[PDB]
Write a protein that binds this ligand. Structure first.
Ligand SMILES: O=C1C[C@@H](C(=O)N(c2ccc(N3CCCC3=O)cc2)c2cccc(Cl)c2)c2ccccc21
Ligand SMILES: O=C1C[C@@H](C(=O)N(c2ccc(N3CCCC3=O)cc2)c2cccc(Cl)c2)c2ccccc21
Ligand code: NA
Ligand code: NA
Ligand code: NA
Lengths: 305, 305
């Protein structure tokens, strides 16, 4: 028992992190097989960040202008290319620590672990969600660019995020590993609007199921609702509308607990309308939305990698 | 910017985890150099757990009764010995992935990362604190015994915790790596009192400093206090008394922010007495106490290992 915000064990990813330097600019890269992936703004000076012409900037660079260090080992760069907002540096050595891996583009509301890195060295790991507005609420300082987000299934690492920028509002933006931003963002030092965000309803409901499995049960009530009725409440409180596909995904937790999804929705509706009355659920005084239904089942069943 | 409950990168520890089986009972062990460390209740059956005579149970075991598997590496056991509540299995192979390491006994209020493991395989990592009453609020299922807690400083892993037990209250108890329990606990399936817990005041203050550094400043007030006055409030709210040693440890954050420690104490006093009025600090609606002053500085300054 217990329920924590648990990250994937980071060692398979740690072995892939390198330092990339171009002129005087340094950030992290990801070394998989004989390619290093990093944010393309490695080729910028501070002057350039306001409005970079990345194609013109990169034309000034040759292979020997990219220094890649993996611990104390220098890698030889033999090719470079830009793909969207990432650079791909071909190196003459396959990383011996390459895990089984895939690149995935995750959906809003999905979770992943971040390995925060500086100078190609890991500093910490934490779990977060992709917000409905395609930002993440991370913890990142200058130099953290090229830090990656991932999920692990048994021996296979699915990379989903590469960190690029902090917005002037203090939330974080980045790309998939093919260099396409999540959300409307561009890699330039400019104020940039993020959507209105919303709370990830299916995750809240998953966490309430977690709470019940752990014996926090005070918020269960004698009420039920309908999808339509609940969705009126969701709208008012800036929650995502619930769909039957969400109901289906919550079926395992419903069966495990015996609590019908729409009954748990009725519990949630009462918490939205009445608040928590100075009580807590799984150590939280807010409704928590950074656990997926898959996360709840995996933590509550001890799955390993 | 941003502030998250960040764990240490777990790779150096993942390479030390092994499966230990004795008869039909399986749990995790920690393979360092040519020794494997695990909880001594590996030698029990379910019927033994109510009142184990560990010395008598262990006298029935020889080296060949302990199976140790490191992935599919099967290790040969050439010696065994009990130290307090831990078994030490001497093996004929030094672990090639052994990090630089030390064993430490941490103090209540200090934090560490847990690598939760099952069958010798890592499932997740999360950060937690040693409570004032020497329990931890973890996430652990049957099979998790032998999972360890640690801190990393550059290249050196300081092991501080080995998981042993869930109490019937659903909080967790364990030992240092010399097998001595934190707290009054014994390794037996019996109800065991943990005694009154308290909030780790110096950590709450550290986290308020973190909040200020991150621009969450609404709780700063026009007031100051004294140590004595604050300690009366701490007592009423089951907070640890603040001492000048704690004030000294908070000096770096006080200097960074320009807020004198007793001024921050007065902000904390007002939050204790008035609550948060439906507001949040660093995404929490409670006062958080699982970050040490060293943790805040490390996260806010980007230190790597
Ligand atoms: O999470 C981050 C990463 C970083 C960031 O956001 N940058 C950034 C990247 C490179 C530089 N460089 C390059 C040359 C010398 C230098 O400092 C600076 C800032 C950024 C800004 C806007 C647009 C983009 Cl695409 C990127 C940052 C700075 C402060 C606090 C947090 C964070
Ligand atoms: O975090 C844990 C670890 C585990 C626990 O607490 N055990 C435990 C250890 C071994 C067995 N064994 C041995 C033989 C087959 C078997 O099941 C069982 C329970 C325990 C209980 C009381 C006293 C002590 Cl020292 C240990 C547990 C069970 C359920 C949920 C969570 C947790
Ligand atoms: Na997030
Ligand atoms: Na983004
Ligand atoms: Na303990």
């Amino acid at each position: 028992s217990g329920f924590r915000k648990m990250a994937f064990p980071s060692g398979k990813v740690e072995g892939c992190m390198v330092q990339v330097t171009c002129g005087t600019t340094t950030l992290n890269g990801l070394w998989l097989d004989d390619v290093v992936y990093c944010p393309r703004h490695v080729i910028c000076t501070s002057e350039d960040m306001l409005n970079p012409n990345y194609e013109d900037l990169l034309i000034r660079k040759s292979n020997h202008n990219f220094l890649v260090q993996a611990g104390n080992v220098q890698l030889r760069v033999i090719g470079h290319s830009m793909q969207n907002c990432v650079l791909k540096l071909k190196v003459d050595t396959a990383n011996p620590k390459t895990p089984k891996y895939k690149f995935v583009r995750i959906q809003p509301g999905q979770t992943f672990s971040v390995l925060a890195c500086y100078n190609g060295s890991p500093s910490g790991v934490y779990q977060c969600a992709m917000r409905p507005n395609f930002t993440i609420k991370g913890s990142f300082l200058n130099g953290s660019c090229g830090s990656v987000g991932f999920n692990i299934d048994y021996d296979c690492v699915s990379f989903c995020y590469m960190h690029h920028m902090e917005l002037p509002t203090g939330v974080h933006a980045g790309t998939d590993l093919e260099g396409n931003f999540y959300g409307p963002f561009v890699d330039r030092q400019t104020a940039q609007a993020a959507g209105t965000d919303t709370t990830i309803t299916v995750n809240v409901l998953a966490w309430l199921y977690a709470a019940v499995i752990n014996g926090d049960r005070w918020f269960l009530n004698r009420f039920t609702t309908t999808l339509n009725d609940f969705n009126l409440v969701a709208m008012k409180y800036n929650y995502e509308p619930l769909t039957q596909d969400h109901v289906d995904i919550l079926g395992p937790l419903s069966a495990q607990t015996g609590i019908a999804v729409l009954d748990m929705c009725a519990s949630l509706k009462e918490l939205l309308q009445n608040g928590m009355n100075g009580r807590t659920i799984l150590g939280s005084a807010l409704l928590e939305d950074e656990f997926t239904p898959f996360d709840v089942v995996r933590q509550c069943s001890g799955v390993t990698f």
